[PDB]
Amino acid sequence: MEMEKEFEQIDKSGSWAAIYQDIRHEASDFPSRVAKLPKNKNRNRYRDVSPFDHSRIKLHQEDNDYINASLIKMEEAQRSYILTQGPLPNTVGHFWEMVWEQKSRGVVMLNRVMEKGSLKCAQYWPQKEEKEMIFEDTNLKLTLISEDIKSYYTVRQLELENLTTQETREILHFHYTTWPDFGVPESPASFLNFLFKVRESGSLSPEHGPVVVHCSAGIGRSGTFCLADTCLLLMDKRKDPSSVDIKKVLLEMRKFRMGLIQTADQLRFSYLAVIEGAKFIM
Ligand SMILES: CC(=O)Cc1ccc(Cl)c(Cl)c1
């Protein structure tokens, strides 16, 4: 079926939970043996969210190459994304090592450091220009260059230096700051505006490594971001845009990381975002 009318048909019939459970039943199951090794317990935020072995990002290190991060490679859309958990106190250096090694231009953050009164990720970037951060375990230096605070999101320019080689690179930090503590946003307008700002920066384009996107677990809000982006790109590429099937795209993405889209409300919000976004594109 088309999307917008499939949408009203699920609303009128109140069957979002059943649609979402079908997706959960059909989703791929692949091994995640490296994530579960005992030496990696303090590298995982949640015991039930792990990268598959076949798609995990490897650190360029011989001691321990593990990080909780996955490469989502979308062949028809010609887009790639790295989805990862919010960094932990003992993985902030690994996080920036990955950004460096994978040649990423942008980092997309969809959570606040504290939500619901608890810490959802480490403070992994510097908050003042004159107070830079040094990660001694991976030999990197990170400096805040500029910050632009808007009503729904903040954009930061950061300088990452590889201290071994003295090479430097400019990284863009896109921080969506207004996702509610509970539920999903009422309108997708600010989320779509944010997606378009990431696109306009070059961070999603083939001349750079894959964008790094995270929330707390790296599957819920993060899944919504890449699912909406890929669906809108396919609607622009194809002769028949009504052939784009959001459930089929989500199942393809779940071949590369488990659990993408965590609730039926997130599924409905993804439909809403793609529907409204397709009108603005034209
Ligand atoms: C998927 C979708 O409906 C998007 C779309 C955009 C433009 C056109 Cl002309 C058409 Cl038929 C569909």
From Swiss-Prot:
Chain positions with Cysteine sulfinic acid (-SO2H) modification: 215
Portion of the full-length sequence here: 1 to 282 of 435
Record keywords, A-Z: Acetylation, Endoplasmic reticulum, Hydrolase, Membrane, Oxidation, Phosphoprotein, Protein phosphatase, S-nitrosylation
Binding site for substrate: 181, 215-221, 262
Domain Tyrosine-protein phosphatase, first and last residues per copy: 3-277
Protein name: Tyrosine-protein phosphatase non-receptor type 1
UniProt gene name: PTPN1
Residues at the active site: 215 (phosphocysteine intermediate)
Effect of residue 215 to S: Catalytically inactive mutant; abolishes sulfhydration
UniProt subunit comment: Interacts with EPHA3 (phosphorylated); dephosphorylates EPHA3 and may regulate its trafficking and function. Interacts with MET. Interacts with NCK1.
Residues where Cysteine sulfenic acid (-SOH) is found: 215
Membrane topology type: Peripheral membrane protein
Positions bearing the N,N-(cysteine-1,S-diyl)serine (Cys-Ser) cross-link: 215-216
Consequence the record notes for mutating residue 50 to A/D: No phosphorylation
Residues with the Phosphoserine modification: 50, 242-243
Tissue specificity annotation: Expressed in keratinocytes (at protein level).
GO biological process, one term: platelet-derived growth factor receptor-beta signaling pathway
Catalytic activity: O-phospho-L-tyrosyl-[protein] + H2O = L-tyrosyl-[protein] + phosphate
Family, per entry: Belongs to the protein-tyrosine phosphatase family. Non-receptor class 1 subfamily.
Gene Ontology MF terms in the entry: cadherin binding; enzyme binding; ephrin receptor binding; insulin receptor binding; non-membrane spanning protein tyrosine phosphatase activity; protein kinase binding; protein phosphatase 2A binding; protein tyrosine phosphatase activity
